């Protein structure tokens with residue numbers, strides 16, 4: 319299963335240093351940029367929290383919550399089975415929280431060391447989107463301290479490569495804030 | 502026109518240093534990764550030539566050559582007018598750009614001199630499909646026109662991890678350094 323990603327993370331992520339750690343962000347954001355390229359999402363909100371987690375929210379269709387043919391929710395399939403590779407982020411995170419807005423309601427789905435909890439439905443909403451919050455594993459990673467400048471330069475490039483998409487970045491450690499949107 | 506991209510390159514690529522120079526590669530490759538995400542291309546070949554140019558080839562549908570609804574060819578539109586396709590910026594910041602497109606049973610040639618198109622030369626029949634882009638970054642615009650192999654390799658490796666199953670090949674013709682990035 320995902321123990322393969324934990325045994326040899328280089329084969330899925332590259333390294334376990336600062337580049338591999340930042341790759342977790344590139345992976346989650348890339349999935350949202352793909353939803354924007356698909357013609358559904360218009361913005362990506364990235365938040366570096368003081369607790370060591372990174373939250374990425376989009377206004378896309380939202381990851382399907384309906385039960386897959388594999389006898390588990392589609393979100394659990396996405397998050398647990400190995401161009402979507404967010405299961406690798408899950409595998410290398412002590413915790414991951416998925417908040418999905420679709421089918422007229424808000425949906426909650428957490429993972430403890432990649433192990434799913436129950437899918438909690440609650441609170442009706444007309445809005446759509448996917449929220450992913452993950453806590454990178456300190457045992458796997460050489461460092462779990464994200465660099466604001468690194469995330470900003472990359473998120474700016476993504477905004478240049480996908481003209482018209484809005485990418486917002488907030489570092490809740492210092493209140494540093496950036497908005498990247500281009501013609 | 503594209504003189505706006507040349508007057509303020511930063512407003513279209515960020516900077517004119519090492520990052521902005523490497524961004525030209527990210528831009529061309531991103532368009533090919535998009536053709537792979539679309540379900541047509543399976544590989545991207547990147548070549549850092551000794552002359553200062555970068556060549557990016559894919560096996561996608563190929564940029565349409567047919568006369569566009571608004572004057573000049575669909576490629577001339579792509580390359581000269583400012584969806585998530587921004588190659589016209591690479592053209593604008595390059596002294597030269599060569600486009601080789603394989604589609605509609607033939608091989609197609611289209612070059613640009615400081616973004617100004619030449620004629621579209623049709624020649625040689627081919628069953629194969631794809632887009633080839635070779636560009637010479639402008640030394641007047643850029644602080645440096647020397648590409649770093651390690652920089653291109655780390656980024657092309659990331660792209661291969663983000664798009665599992667896509668093959669990305671890199672060759673640096675200045676030293677013969679070669680890399681193949683393909684993952685599960």
Ligand SMILES: CO[C@H]1CN(c2nc(-c3ncnn3C)c(C(=O)O)s2)CC[C@H]1NC(=O)c1[nH]c(C)c(Cl)c1Br
Nearest residue numbers: 346349350353374376378379380381382402404448450
């Ligand atoms: C894998 O989910 C992606 C595709 N999604 C859908 N696919 C289908 C579908 N097409 C065919 N059959 N089906 C069931 C839908 C439907 O019919 O309703 S919706 C929408 C959400 C997407 N993911 C993200 O935006 C995303 N965002 C972040 C931050 C991460 Cl991380 C991810 Br991953």
Ligand SMILES: CO[C@H]1CN(c2nc(-c3ncnn3C)c(C(=O)O)s2)CC[C@H]1NC(=O)c1[nH]c(C)c(Cl)c1Br
Nearest residue numbers: 529532533536557559561562563564565586588632634
């Ligand atoms: C901008 O063209 C892109 C889309 N292309 C097509 N689109 C349509 C289409 N669908 C709807 N209407 N039309 C006309 C086609 C058709 O059906 O005939 S083909 C395929 C090639 C693509 N570009 C690249 O692969 C590409 N590669 C590199 C290295 C760079 Cl740089 C670029 Br840009």
Ligand SMILES: [Ca+2]
Nearest residue numbers: 550552554635
């Ligand atoms: Ca030659």
